[PDB]
Symmetry: D2
Subunit: 487 residues, 4 copies
C-alpha cells in the first residue's frame, strides 16, 4: 500500500505521527497514505534549506540556470509518468495534464535565463567621480504553498524562479494530490541541484503555520482560495516577512452581438469545463449583451455540450474528469441546487451525471445555467466545478459594471470583432488578466500572472518578471575612490 | 497664534475640534497651533482624491509630467522661504535645508520622465497570431505618511511619483514641522495640478488610522520609526491594501587601516552630526579595525569636533541646529548618560551645550563616545541625535559580523583604498544601502531607497524605479482576432 | 543686407568668403544672406567641440540634464519668435510651426531623463567572485545634418539627446531656413551649456564633406532625401565612423470599407496638406479598397478641401504656407501635370493657386488626384507637396502588396473599425511606423522614429531610445580582485 | 581524400568547379579538399533562406527557442567530436576547443531566452485614447562571415541569436577549418530546425561578394581582420544593408607596482600563449609601469614559460598547438626577427621550437620579447601568434596614453589592488572591453562583445543584447479607435 513522505535535503523521510488518505477521485477509492508533517519536520526542511543557502547564494547564476536546463529535459522525458500521477489523484485526463505540464515547463524555460533577469542597473557619475548600481540579491529561505488543481504547474510558478534567483525553497503542496508534485521535485536532484536547495514538506494547516512562524522564512508565496489567501497574507505580514497570496475567481466573458458565436462557443467549452471547471481562470460566467446573443449562445452551447464526455483519466478522449473530493462534489451540486431554487434555468443538468460506468467516484457532468442574476449566491460565489452561468444584459457597459461590481477580478474576456470595444474593455475593466477573444487569458511564462481586487494580496505577481523581484531584495551600492595615491 | 490647517481639494480648511503645539526648537517657544484632523476630515480629503481620480487616471503621462516640470521650477524659485519654513520648525540651518530640498527636487526631476517609466512590455506572438502586453495602471487614492526629520524631501519621495503615475494622494506629514510640507503642496496647484489630486491632511494617530481603515485608499507609503512602521505594515495588510513602510537605523562605518584617516574623519563629521544627527542615514557608529586606527580616529575626531558650531538657523554658518522637541532632547541626553554608566568613555560631552546664547531651546552639542560594546543599550537602540559612538574590533570580519548582527540594516559605509575589501564588503554585508568611501550612501532619485532586516517592511523600496511599481498595478492583456471576414 | 553667421565656441562668427540667398518663400524676395562655411571654418567648430569634450564627458548626467531642463523653459518662452523665424524662411504658418516646436521640446523633455536612459547592466558573479557591467560612454564630437522641412524639430531630434549623452555637437542645417535653427542653439548658452559643446556651422556640400572626412567626428546623424542620405551613409561608412541616415517617403493609407470616412477624411486633410505636404510623414497616397469607399473618400475629401486656405504666415488661419523654393514649386507643378498626362483625374486643381494676393512666391494649392495607377511616375517618386493621390484596388491584400512593393517604407496607415484587419496590417506591412486610424503615426519623443527599406540607412533610428545607443558606445568591464590581504 | 561540401536547404551539396586544401597544421599534410562555392551556389543558399523565411518569421519565439534548447544538448552530446574536428584543422588542443565550445553553447543558452529578449515597449495614452508600442521584427535573410581561429564559437555568436530572432541565415566560414562549423550546422536539423533556415556555404572572396551584393541579404555580421572588416563594412554600406564588422587587436595589460605578480604571470600565460596567441583577445603586450615591476614580470614569466608544452592536439596536456598555416608561421617568425632586428631583447626564443617530434607542421613556441618600443613594427602590428611583448614606462598615465595611441582598442587589462586606479583606468581607457585583474575580459553570452576604434566598424556589437537589436528592425505602431458604434449599445 505504501506511504508518501517528504523531500528534505535530497532524501525521502517520513515522520509517522499522523497520516491522511489520498484518493483516486474517479473510483472514489483510497489510493495512498500521506504522512502529514508536524512543526518539527517542517523545521528540518527549513534547516536544510538554510544550511544550503550560503554556497548556493554565491553560486553563479549561469551555473544555477544550468540545473533548470537539465530539469527541463527531465520533465519532458518523464512526461507520461508525471501526467499519470496527476491523473491518478487529481483525476484530470492526459491532455489537461499535458497542458499543465507544458506551461510548467515554460516557467522552467523562462528561469533558464536567470542571468539576463538578474541584471542590476549601473549608473556612471551620480556625482563627480562617483558610481552607483543596483543588485538584486537572494532572500534566503523561501516558502511556497500550492493548491490541488495544478499540483505541477503552480509549484513550477514558484521554485524554478526562486531557486535560480539564489534562494532555497520549502514547498508545502496540496494534500489531495501530492505524488505528482513530489515526483517532479525528486527529478531536480538528478538535474544536479545540491541537496537542501529544494525541499517538499507534505501536510495540512500545521505545516503551513510552521512555515509562517519560522524567522528563517523570508518570503511566502501562496496560491489558493481567497479566505486562505487572506489568512496567509495577514499572518505573514504580521510576522514581518514578505508575501504574495493569490485568491479565487469568478471569470466573466462578454459576448458582443458582433462576435463570432461559433468560435465563442467552441472556446467556452474548454474554458468553462476544461479540468472539470476546477481552474482559477475558469470561464464560469458568460454575460450576453442582448438576446439576440443570449438565445443563440445558450442554443449553440447546449448543442456542443451534448458531445462532452465525462469519465476517468484511464480513458483518453474524455473531455474532463472527476471533481477532487466527495466534499467538493457535494458543494458543486449544492450550488446548482441553489441556482435552480433561486430561479435560474438549468438548461443542461449534470448533477446526476451517472455517465460512469463502474464509478461512484466524485463526478459532476457539464452544466449550463441560464437567466442568472447578481442576487444569486451561486453567481456571487466561486463554484469551482464544470458549470457555466449566463447573465443577460442590455448594453456592454452594463456587463462591465457587473464585472467590476464583483468581489473577484482575476481573469476576464470579451468576444468581439471591433477594435474600439476591445480597447475600451482592456483599458477600463478592473481585472488583472484580460482576454480579447481569449477566454483563458493566462500570461505566458515570460509575463506575470495575477488578479486584482480580492483575487490577489500583495504588490508583486506570480512567475515572470515580478517573481524575480519578489524572490530578491534590492541592494544599492554607491562607490567612490578619493585616495589617488597609487595612480 | 495662527492655526495650521489642511489642503483639501485645493483649499485651506480647518476642523477646529482639537489642536497641538508646533515649536520653534531654537527658542523653545510655541510658534503655531496645528489643527489635527479627525476621521471625518480625512474622509473629506479621501473623497476629494477619489473624486479627482477618474479624469486624472486618463490624463496622458506626458501632460501629468508637465505638472512636475512646472513644480520643479516653483520649488527652486521658492527655495529660500521653504528653507526658512524648514528651519523655523525643524530647526535645521539653511545649508541642511537646501540639501534636503535639492534631493527633493531630484525626485521631481525623475518623475518628469514618467512616460519612459510607465512603459509596459509588449510581446509578439506568444501563441500563433496572439499578442500580449503589460500595463502598469494607477492604483486610485494613495496614502503617504512621513516623519519630522525630512518634512520636504520624504514627502517628495512619494507624491510626485505617485501623482505622475496617475494616482491621487493624501499626505499625512509629521505634526512637529508641517509648515514646509504644506507650503510645497500649495505650489502644486500653481504648477497646474487639478484640485483634489493632491491633499494634505494634518494630524496624529487618529488621521493615520482613518487612512488605514478607508477602503478607498489602495496603497500606503510609510516612512518613520520601526515600531510604527511595523504597526502600519501589519495594519494595512490586515485591511487588504498594499504597503511599504520604512523604519529606523543604526548605520555603521568600518574604518580600515589603509583608509585616509583625515578624509574619513572630515566625512564622518557631517555624517554623524549633520542635521543634528536626526537622520535615517546618519552615520552613528564608527567601527575601527585595529587600534592603530581606533586611537587615531578618536584623536583626530576630537580635534575636528572642536570647530563645531551649534546654534539657531537664524545664524547661517552653524553646522547644525537643535533637536526637534524637549522630549527628544531629554531622550538623547538619556542615551549619553546610559553610555557613560554602562562603561563608555564620553570623549567629547555635549549634554550641556549651553552654546546658545539666548536659547534654552532643544540643543544638544556634538558628543563622542569611545569604547562602546554590543551589550550597551545606547548602541542597540537608535539615538537619533548628534552622537557618534566608536567600537573597536580586531578584524574587518568582526566589524561586518557586528553590523549583520544589528537589528537594523539601513545604511553602511567602508573607508578603504583596496578593491577586494570593498567588493567583499558590498556583496556580503546585510544592509540595503552600501557606501565605499561614502558615509551617506543615499541613492539618487533614479534609484530606490530602502533598508534590509527591520529597517523596511515590504518588497518595494522608496522612490525611483520601485515607486513606479508600487504606485501602479500590473494588467496583462492577451489579444487574438479570430475572424478575418473584413480582410476578405 | 543682414548676413547669418555660425555658432562656434559660444560666439557668432562669420567667414565672408562665399554666401547664399535665403528667401521669403511667401513674397519670393531675398530676405537675408547666409554665410557658407569652408572646410577651415568647419574645422574650427570641430576643434571647439573636441576641446570642450573631455570635461563635458566626465560631467554627471544629472548636471548635463539640468541644461536641457532650462532649455525647455527657454524654448517655450521664445516660442513666438521661433515660430516667426521658421515661418519667415520656410513659410509655414504659426500652428504648424508651434507643432514642430512642441515635438522638438518633447525631445528635450525626454533628454532631461538622461540618467535613467544611460543606465548600464550590472551582473553579479559571471564567474565565482567576478562581476561585470556595461557602460554606455560618450562618442566624442558628433555631427548633425538636417533638412529644411523641420529646421527646429529635426535638429532637436539630434543635439538634445547627443549632448546629454556626454558628446559635443556640430550641426549643419538646411541653408534654405537657418535663422530659426541658429536662434535656438543660441538659447543653449543661456541655459548653462559650456562653450563649444554645441556648435552650428552653416554651409553647403563643402561643410558636409568637411564633417564627413574629419577623424575627430565620430558619428553622423543625417535626415533628408534618399539620394543624399545614401551618399552620407556611404561616405561616413567608408571613413570608418558610425551613421544613421533617414531618407524619403511615399506614405500610403488603406481606407477599408468599414472605415469611419468622416474621420479619415478629416485627419487626411492635415496629414496630406499640413505643412504644405513638405513632410517625411506626409500622407500622399490614399489606397481605397473597393469603390464603394473610393467614390466616398474622393467625395468627402473634395468637400472638406474647398474650405482650405493657402497663404503667407503673416495671416494665421491659413491652413498651410508656400513651398520652399521656385525650383521646388516648378517640380510640384510638374508632378501634377504628369498625373494628368499619364491619365489620372485632377479632381481638385491647385496648380494655379493664384490665391495670394501680393505674392508671386512659391505657392501651390491643395490638390486631389484620382485614378492613379502604379505605372505613373507621380505615384513612384516623392512629390513632397500638397497633393493627395487616390489609388483604387480590389482587396486589402492588394493594397498591402502595393505598399510593400514601393521603394520607400517610412510611414503608413489603415483606417478600419476591425481589429483583425488592424493587427494583420500592423504585423505584416513592411514599413517602420504604422498607424491605426492615425495617418501621421509619428512616434513620440520616448519612442524612436525610423523607416524601413530605402527610407533609412543604418540600424538605430532617430531620437528616443535608439538615439541613446547611437550617441554612446558600449564598454564592458570585467572585475576580479585576487588578493584579500588588507581585508585579513 | 574526402570533399567538404555545403549545407543548403538541409542537404549536403557540392558544386565541384573549384577546390582548396585544408591542412592538418600539426603534421603539415593535406587532410581534406574544400569545395569553393561560386556566386550561383551562394544564390541557391540565399533562395533556400528566403523561401523558408515567411513561415519562420511568423513562428512564435517560444517555438523558435526550443530549437536552441535542443541544439544546446546536441552540442554537449557531440562535444568530443566537435573538439576533434577543431583540433584536426585549426590544431588547438582539447581544453582550448572545449573552452571554445563551452562559450558557444553559452551563446545558445542566451538565445533560448528569445521571448524575454524580443519584448518591445508598450505605451498607454501617448495622446488621449491613443496607444503606441514598439516591435522588433525580423530582418529576413542574414549573412554571417567568420574567421579561422574560432570556427565554432564565433559562428555561434551569430546564427543562434539571428535564427531565434525570426531570420534565416547563410554562413560563410573560414576555408582553413570548415569541418567543425558544418558539423555543428548539421546538428541543427536534428534539433528540429526547418530546412533552409540555416545554411553553410564554404568559399573565399567570391562567396563573400555574392552575399554582399545580393539584395535579399538584409544584414551582414563579419568577424575577422581589420583590413577585411573595413572592406566588408564599406561594401555592405554601399549596397544599403546594415553591417557590423569586428577587426584586429593589440591587447595591453598594465602591471602596476601593487599588483600580485604571481597571479598576473599565471594569468598572462593563458592569455598570451593560449590558443597559440591566435585570438582577438590575446594579451600580446604587458605594459610594466616602473622596473621594479618590469624586471619582476620578466623574471617570473621566463620561469613559468619553461614549463610550456607545444605540440599536436593528439597529445592532450600540451598547452597549445600549431599555428594555422605555413604562411602564418613565416609571418609570426617574421615579426620576432623584426623585433630583434629593431633592438628588442628576445628573452625566450620559440622561433625554432623543434619540440615536435615527427612534426614539421606550423609550430611556434611561446616567446617573450623585452624592451619593445612604440616605434617597432612588431608592436604596431598584430602578430597573432604565441608572443608576449613587454613595454616599460614611468607612470600609469604613460601606459594609458600608449594604449589610447594604438590603432586598435579591442580589449585591455589592468593588474592592481587599488580601487582608485581600477576605476580611473576602466572609466577613461579607450577600449571596448576592460579587465580588472582579468587579462581576458571576454563578455559573457548575456553581454555583448565589441572593440573600439579600428577594432570594430558599426554601432551594435557582437552577440548578447546588441545582437537582438542588430538581427531585428524596430517597428512602431500607433493605434486609435475613433468609432464607438458597437460598444453603444
Ligand atoms: N488566483 C490564482 O492564482 C489561482 C490559480 C489556481 C487556483 N487557485 C485556487 O486554488 C483553490 C483550490 O485549491 P485548494 O482547495 O487546495 O486551495 P486552498 O484555498 O485550500 O489552499 C491551498 C493550500 O492551502 C492550505 N490550506 C487549506 N486550508 C487551510 C487553513 N485553514 N489554514 C492554512 N492553510 C490551509 C492547503 O493545505 C493547501 O496546500 C481555488 O479556490 C482557487 O481559487 C487560485
Ligand atoms: N571580434 C574580433 O575582434 C575578432 C575575434 C577573433 C578574431 N579576429 C580576427 O580574425 C583574424 C584571423 O582570421 P582570418 O585570417 O580567417 O581573418 P580574415 O580577416 O582573413 O577574414 C576571415 C573571413 O573573411 C573571409 N575573407 C578573407 N579574405 C577576404 C577578402 N579579401 N574578401 C572577402 N572576404 C575575405 C574568409 O573567407 C573568412 O571567412 C585576425 O586578424 C583577428 O584580428 C577578430
Amino acid at each position: 500500500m505504501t506511504t508518501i513522505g517528504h523531500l528534505i535535503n535530497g532524501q525521502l523521510v517520513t515522520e509517522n505521527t499522523r497520516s491522511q488518505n489520498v484518493f483516486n477521485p474517479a473510483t472514489g477509492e483510497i489510493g495512498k497514505q500521506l504522512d502529514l508533517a508536524s512543526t518539527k519536520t517542517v523545521e528540518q526542511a527549513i534547516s536544510a534549506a538554510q544550511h544550503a543557502f550560503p554556497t548556493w547564494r554565491n553560486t553563479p547564476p549561469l551555473k544555477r540556470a544550468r540545473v533548470m536546463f537539465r530539469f527541463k529535459e527531465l520533465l519532458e522525458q518523464h512526461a507520461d509518468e508525471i501526467c499519470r500521477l496527476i491523473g491518478e489523484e487529481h483525476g484530470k485526463i492526459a491532455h489537461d495534464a499535458m497542458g499543465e505540464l507544458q506551461r510548467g515547463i515554460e516557467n522552467v524555460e523562462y528561469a533558464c535565463g536567470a542571468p539576463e533577469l538578474l541584471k542590476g542597473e549601473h549608473s556612471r557619475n551620480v556625482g563627480p567621480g562617483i558610481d552607483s548600481w543596483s543588485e538584486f540579491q537572494p532572500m534566503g529561505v523561501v516558502a511556497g504553498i500550492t493548491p490541488f488543481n495544478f499540483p505541477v504547474m503552480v509549484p513550477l510558478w514558484m521554485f524554478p524562479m526562486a531557486i535560480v534567483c539564489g534562494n532555497c525553497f520549502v514547498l508545502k503542496p496540496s494534500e489531495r494530490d501530492p505524488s505528482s508534485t513530489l515526483y517532479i521535485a525528486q527529478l531536480l536532484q538528478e538535474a544536479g541541484l545540491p541537496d537542501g536547495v529544494m525541499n517538499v514538506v507534505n501536510g495540512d494547516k500545521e505545516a503551513v503555520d510552521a512555515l509562517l512562524h519560522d524567522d528563517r522564512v523570508k518570503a511566502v508565496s501562496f496560491v489558493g482560495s481567497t479566505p486562505i489567501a487572506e489568512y496567509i497574507y495577514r499572518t505573514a505580514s504580521a510576522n514581518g516577512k514578505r508575501c504574495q497570496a493569490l485568491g479565487g475567481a469568478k471569470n466573466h466573458a462578454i459576448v458582443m452581438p458582433d462576435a463570432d458565436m461559433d468560435n465563442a462557443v467552441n472556446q467556452l467549452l474548454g474554458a468553462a469545463f476544461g479540468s472539470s471547471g476546477e481552474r482559477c481562470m475558469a470561464l464560469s460566467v458568460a454575460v450576453a449583451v442582448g438576446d439576440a446573443a443570449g438565445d443563440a449562445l445558450v442554443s449553440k452551447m447546449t448543442q456542443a455540450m451534448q458531445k462532452l464526455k465525462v469519465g476517468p483519466s484511464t480513458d483518453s478522449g474524455n473531455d474532463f474528469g472527476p471533481v477532487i473530493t466527495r466534499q467538493h462534489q457535494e458543494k458543486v451540486i449544492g450550488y446548482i441546487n441553489s441556482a435552480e431554487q433561486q430561479g435560474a434555468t438549468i438548461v443542461v443538468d449534470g448533477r446526476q451525471p451517472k455517465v460512469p460506468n463502474h464509478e461512484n467516484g466524485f463526478f459532476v457532468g457539464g452544466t449550463l445555467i441560464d437567466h442568472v442574476t447578481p442576487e444569486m449566491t451561486s453567481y456571487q460565489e466561486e463554484i469551482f466545478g464544470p458549470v457555466l452561468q449566463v447573465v443577460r444584459v442590455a448594453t456592454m457597459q452594463d456587463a462591465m459594471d457587473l464585472i467590476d461590481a464583483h468581489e473577484y477580478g482575476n481573469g476576464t474576456c470579451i468576444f468581439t470583432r471591433d477594435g474600439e470595444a476591445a480597447r475600451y474593455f482592456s483599458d477600463n475593466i478592473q481585472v488583472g488578466m484580460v482576454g480579447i477573444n481569449i477566454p483563458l487569458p493566462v500570461p505566458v511564462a515570460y509575463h506575470s500572472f495575477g488578479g486584482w481586487k480580492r483575487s490577489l494580496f500583495g504588490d508583486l505577481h506570480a512567475y515572470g518578471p515580478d517573481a524575480v523581484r519578489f524572490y530578491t531584495k534590492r541592494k544599492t551600492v554607491t562607490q567612490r575612490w578619493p585616495s589617488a595615491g597609487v595612480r
